[PDB]
Swiss-Prot record, chain B:
Function summary: Acts as a component of the translation initiation factor 2B (eIF2B) complex, which catalyzes the exchange of GDP for GTP on the eukaryotic initiation factor 2 (eIF2) complex gamma subunit. Its guanine nucleotide exchange factor activity is repressed when bound to eIF2 complex phosphorylated on the alpha subunit, thereby limiting the amount of methionyl-initiator methionine tRNA available to the ribosome and consequently global translation is repressed.
Origin: domain of life: Eukaryota
Full protein name: Translation initiation factor eIF2B subunit alpha
InterPro entries found in the cross-reference section: eIF2B_alpha/beta/delta, elF-2B_alpha_N, IF-2B-related, IF_2B-like_C, NagB/RpiA_transferase-like
One GO BP annotation of this record: cytoplasmic translational initiation
Hydrolase as UniProt keyword: no
Subcellular location as annotated: Cytoplasm, Cytosol
Family recorded in the similarity comment: Belongs to the eIF-2B alpha/beta/delta subunits family.
Outcome of mutating E41K: Increases guanyl-nucleotide exchange factor activity on eIF2
Subunit structure: Component of the translation initiation factor 2B (eIF2B) complex which is a heterodecamer of two sets of five different subunits: alpha, beta, gamma, delta and epsilon. Subunits alpha, beta and delta comprise a regulatory subcomplex and subunits epsilon and gamma comprise a catalytic subcomplex. Within the complex, the hexameric regulatory complex resides at the center, with the two heterodimeric catalytic subcomplexes bound on opposite sides.
GO molecular function, one term: translation initiation factor activity
Source organism (scientific name): Schizosaccharomyces pombe (strain 972 / ATCC 24843) (Fission yeast)
UniProtKB/Swiss-Prot annotation, chain C:
InterPro entries, sorted: eIF2B_alpha/beta/delta (IPR051501), elF-2B_alpha_N (IPR042528), IF-2B-related (IPR000649), IF_2B-like_C (IPR042529), NagB/RpiA_transferase-like (IPR037171)
Gene: gcn3
Name of the molecule in the record: Translation initiation factor eIF2B subunit alpha
Molecular function as annotated in GO: guanyl-nucleotide exchange factor activity; translation initiation factor activity
Known function: Acts as a component of the translation initiation factor 2B (eIF2B) complex, which catalyzes the exchange of GDP for GTP on the eukaryotic initiation factor 2 (eIF2) complex gamma subunit. Its guanine nucleotide exchange factor activity is repressed when bound to eIF2 complex phosphorylated on the alpha subunit, thereby limiting the amount of methionyl-initiator methionine tRNA available to the ribosome and consequently global translation is repressed.
Keyword Cell membrane: no
GO terms classed as biological process: cytoplasmic translational initiation; negative regulation of TORC1 signaling; translational initiation
Disulfide bonds: none
Impact when changing E41K: Increases guanyl-nucleotide exchange factor activity on eIF2
PANTHER family: TRANSLATION INITIATION FACTOR EIF-2B SUBUNIT ALPHA (PTHR45860:SF1)
Zinc recorded as keyword: no
Impact after mutating F237V: Decreases the amount of gcn3 in the eIF2B complex
Subcellular location: Cytoplasm, Cytosol
Curated annotation (Swiss-Prot), chain D:
GO biological process, one term: regulation of translation
Entry's localization field: Cytoplasm, Cytosol
Native source species: Schizosaccharomyces pombe (strain 972 / ATCC 24843)
InterPro entries in the cross-refs: eIF2B_beta_subunit, IF-2B-related, IF_2B-like_C, M1Pi_N, NagB/RpiA_transferase-like
Name this protein carries in UniProt: Translation initiation factor eIF2B subunit beta
């Protein structure tokens, strides 16, 4: 149930100009990446709540759910968008539900099977809804700050760390331990898509006083034998605990398992999406052949299939530890983390 | 009032009812004829009936999962304020509601299951299981192109009923002998089985050949999904694939001191040369599948991979 | 000359013969009735004769091995200033004196195999194998106390024949279904199987349920020993445990259009597959060498299984 | 077929005084360990060949086999003895076959084909070949230690257990040029005293040595680059009869994806197939793990002290021998070119 049915698009425009604008920038992929998408989605939702007027609570919920739905289908593999939507939806229900308690005078799912089969429903919840939304936007700005501090428990002197591509979270993680401890980091370029980003990050790691080595993706297996830990960033973490990450990460994860090297993942909880990876064919996106084969190679591109995926998938069993802003947890416990941050109904948006 | 043949009396009457649910219903039938005198004994007649039901059925793991859920429900509702007769009142009225709720479970399981099957895939199944079919049939209703390998399940031979069901839905099927399962894995895209019960560590208690498929799958790097209702979750922990209560003594040898009384071309098909019923009773009926062989558990509560998640549900259940 | 008819002929002639040897005897009695006398005539011969033999029997691996051994013995002493005829009589002369060693190879195997069974151990075997039986029986005469699980081996149903064979020697036996083999592994101390043929990398070609046992054995950390005579070594390299010449079309599906309850304790012996369906299932599987602990042969126990390769290397130049 | 038959006790004592003294010292554990048993056996064989008189090669063979059978039974888990015997037995056989026709492929093809002064004063030649064995038994530590510049590199961490003169010579040779580290797990209770002594000698060579308890083996394993072990014997299936606790190193290494390297002379390689481990594993005195003055404890509890440990053939990655470096899969061809595969059972 998208927003087209509820209202004409022409006035999902004058009533919600931020939504139609975000949908456009999401499809064209001008606003891309987990963090950027998350922030912009939250901001758009803020002016949606700011301008929507929904007097029983169910009009709000239906509005945000429908508006969030079209934001999801604009660019379905940017799961951070849908996650923000699910947060705000639980923000309303719980807050309102708490409001319901305010007027005066489950706990198992299994037990329910034998279970048994409003007053002043209200608007002007805006103040608290906008509050919690602004909070979320803030809590997004603190992810690196309270993640990097956990590096003193996993990064030690003279250890060798393998990482791939560019991750601002991982970079922060490394540099925070780098101030007091001197170690080594091998940066595998994320060719062809995370190439420049990783090359740039590698320079800064070196400037931070870290013994940085830059290797091609083919060299990953060759140096795995002298690597203590693998530290990876991720684009998204799905419902089963699997990783939607940037291409080439499978090389690292597989080579790590083979050499019995631990795989650590640093990621904010906002990248944790409840959607189940039914078909990986829909999850992996493909960019232009341009990044791999040059266009002036007329004969080659005419006689060959050139494929450039910029997403890789890691099964949840190849991740030993998740470093999050909520702390360090095994892939197993991600199950309960989702149950605490999302309402189960919002799994399909 | 015989609860055992009543628990039985729920199974042949309803083909789509599950053993834990049937056990729950059998306990409801007990509380309607209870006429309990005090609370202390509203619980022990519930206790006595639950126990004697467990003793009267040979494979009791599934129904015990229901018995567990039931007494825990009663205990939790009686602890709070303990009007044991409202409790009785509650169960008896909403009794058939529990049965339809269970049917709603399998339906939700099917809706979560069919997206796992994609265009032009091949599915392997061990024996017959309601829910496994429900997922497959639901995938067919969406006109998804897929084919299904089915294993004959000695001794029950449930594979024949399963493949009949599947081609009654006009889906292509090919039966495979229990010994030929692993050979077919290179053609298999997904393995899908059902469960009689799910133990604490998220392991599977099902008919004899399941764990075999689970190993062949992991060896062939093929995903292995199971289909189980949340009320099949039981609090018990087998320390191995061999640690479950046996109804009748199995896997024992003869003692041949005295005389008598008294090559296959390997291309020869001798269906007359199968084991007789006596020595088949000497074989295990059930099978335990450790959670590291299970990709995901398709339940009414969603698809569970965690294998601490089944434990999490059991925890919330018992406090 | 209907070589095929002959080859089948030995097979019924003598239960203790092996498919490779039966092929060797085939070529010999062709080499007897073979007028020949041209190397071109002399060597045009069997090749159409083993070829005709290979095309005449549907699963042809084992006889191909016995074949492969025969011609390599032929050309290697036809090389060497080789005269034809002296090998033609010498093969026909010592044809009786071939199925001598073949029988002596199996006994050599049993004398090597039986100490693997030690007092109070439980053995697991799949179907019927003369070599496995030989090892078990040889251990029994030495008054060794042991018991044997035998898998009901569908489709062949060889489990019954092996169970009775071992029952006659006062060996305690117990039959298990093909689906219950995994559940029995904790009670098993050692797994012992035979093989119709052993490929280049030391892998086993045998009955359809073999590889599953080797899989369960690896998982349960139990030793898995194969029992095969040296003349079962064949030069062919399956790239998977699925890569073998198929006799009949296999594992193909129905094509339905709108074409118009069971408990686990229930025992329905009348609910098995029909033979039309069974002919759609494979007859053999392949067991990778990494599942084989040791390969008991008349050459001794081969654990390297780069060593089966070593022997095939020697066979060919 | 031993020498208790075909000869009396007093005849053995008079004719072969070395055999009698070796039997006594093998039973009394006086001569002990692979190297000591190898040398002594080879010297005793030199006397057997010198003393024994025969007219036929066969008499010589079965005479040696009989002496071999008896020496083996004296101390059967000292495989080194029988190996030296089997070595000489083959040495006799093909010295014979080239003397056989100076007077002028596959076992798969034997199935199809042809059916059906020699022995004396090749003694002078036999004795020489025995001395050739003695010489080779001396070059073992030198032929092996040299290969340490292909595996031991600077700043690497190496794990070792117990004591092995071979492994020690291996380490120290690389250590006189390259600077690395060695973690030595003591072989408690048996190789305890010896390993501490080796650890000190290593450190004196400047190898930065760490002595850990056997329980620490797993904990430090994650930082170890390579495992280098010695062995008591290498059996027919490529397995390893080695000193107590060595499987702790092996299992922990496989769990941490750390390569296992074995340093051993070829003479420790025995064709004896391990149909058993119970007959293989010998048990020393409980005195080593429990004091006898614990009256209550020793009368109320089974106290066991295995002397050896077994390691399955597939847990070793590389064999560093005097001949060179070889994979476990190649041990098959090493034997068939060393022993005669009929002397496997002596």
């Amino acid at each position: 149930g998208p927003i087209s049915e509820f209202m004409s698009t022409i006035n999902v425009e004058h009533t919600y100009p931020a939504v139609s604008s975000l949908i456009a920038d999401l499809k064209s992929r001008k606003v891309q990446g987990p963090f950027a998408v998350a922030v912009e989605t939250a901001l758009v939702m803020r002016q949606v709540i700011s301008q929507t007027r929904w007097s029983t609570v169910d009009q709000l919920i239906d509005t945000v759910r429908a508006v969030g739905s079209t934001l999801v289908k604009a660019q379905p593999t940017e799961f951070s968008c849908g996650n923000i939507i699910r947060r705000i939806l639980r923000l309303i229900r719980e807050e309102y539900q708490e409001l319901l308690k305010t007027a005066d005078e489950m706990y198992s799912s299994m037990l329910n099977l034998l279970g048994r089969p409003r007053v002043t429903g209200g608007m002007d919840m805006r103040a608290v809804i906008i509050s919690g939304i602004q909070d979320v936007i803030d809590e997004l700005d603190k992810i690196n700050t309270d993640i990097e501090v956990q590096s003193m428990d996993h990064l030690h002197s003279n250890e060798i760390i393998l990482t791939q591509g560019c991750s601002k979270t991982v970079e922060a993680f490394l540099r925070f331990a780098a101030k007091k401890r001197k170690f080594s980091v091998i940066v595998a370029e994320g060719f062809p898509n995370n190439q420049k980003g990783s090359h740039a990050m590698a320079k800064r790691l070196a400037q931070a006083g870290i013994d940085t080595t830059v290797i091609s993706d083919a060299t990953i297996f060759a140096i795995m034998s002298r690597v203590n830990k693998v530290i990876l960033g991720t684009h998204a973490i799905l419902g089963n605990g699997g990783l939607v990450t940037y291409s080439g990460a499978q090389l690292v994860a597989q080579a790590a398992r083979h050499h019995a090297t631990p795989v650590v993942v640093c990621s904010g909880i906002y990248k944790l999406s409840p959607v189940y990876p039914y078909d990986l064919e829909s999850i992996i996106q493909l960019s232009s052949p341009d990044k791999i084969m040059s266009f002036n190679e007329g004969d080659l591109i005419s006689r060959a299939e050139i494929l450039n995926p910029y997403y890789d998938y890691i099964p949840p069993d190849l991740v030993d530890l998740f470093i999050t802003n909520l702390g360090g947890y095994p892939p197993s416990y991600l199950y309960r983390i989702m149950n605490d941050t999302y309402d189960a109904s919002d799994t399909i948006l | 009032f015989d609860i055992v043949q009543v628990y039985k009396k729920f199974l042949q009457d309803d083909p789509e009812i599950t053993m834990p649910v049937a056990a729950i219903e059998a306990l409801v039938q007990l509380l309607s004829r209870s006429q309990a005198k005090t609370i202390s004994e509203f619980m022990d007649i519930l206790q006595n009936g639950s126990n004697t039901l467990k003793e009267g059925v040979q494979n009791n793991i599934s129904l015990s999962a229901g018995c567990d859920i039931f007494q825990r429900f009663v205990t939790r509702s009686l602890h709070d304020v303990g009007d044991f007769e409202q409790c009785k009142r509650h169960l008896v009225e909403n009794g058939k509601l529990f049965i339809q709720r269970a049917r709603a479970c399998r339906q939700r399981i099917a809706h979560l299951g069919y997206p796992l099957i994609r265009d032009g895939s091949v599915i392997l199944t061990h024996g017959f299981s309601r829910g496994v079919a429900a997922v497959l049939l639901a995938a067919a209703k969406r006109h998804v192109r897929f084919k299904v390998f089915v294993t004959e399940s000695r001794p029950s031979g449930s594979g024949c009923l399963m493949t009949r069901t599947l081609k009654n839905a006009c889906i292509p099927t090919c039966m495979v002998l229990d010994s030929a399962v692993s050979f077919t894995m290179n053609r298999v895209d997904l393995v899908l089985v059902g469960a009689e019960g799910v133990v604490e560590n998220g392991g599977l208690i099902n008919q004899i050949g399941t764990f075999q498929l689970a190993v062949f799958a992991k060896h062939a790097h093929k995903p292995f999904y199971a289909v189980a209702e949340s009320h099949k979750f039981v609090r018990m922990f087998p320390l191995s694939q061999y640690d479950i209560p046996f109804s009748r003594p199995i896997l024992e040898f003869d003692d041949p001191s005295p005389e008598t009384v008294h090559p296959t071309p390997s291309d020869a098909i001798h269906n007359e040369l199968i084991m007789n019923e006596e020595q088949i009773r000497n074989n295990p009926t059930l099978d335990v599948t450790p959670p590291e062989f299970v990709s995901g558990l398709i339940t009414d509560l969603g698809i569970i991979d965690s294998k601490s998640g089944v434990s999490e549900e059991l925890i919330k259940l018992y406090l």
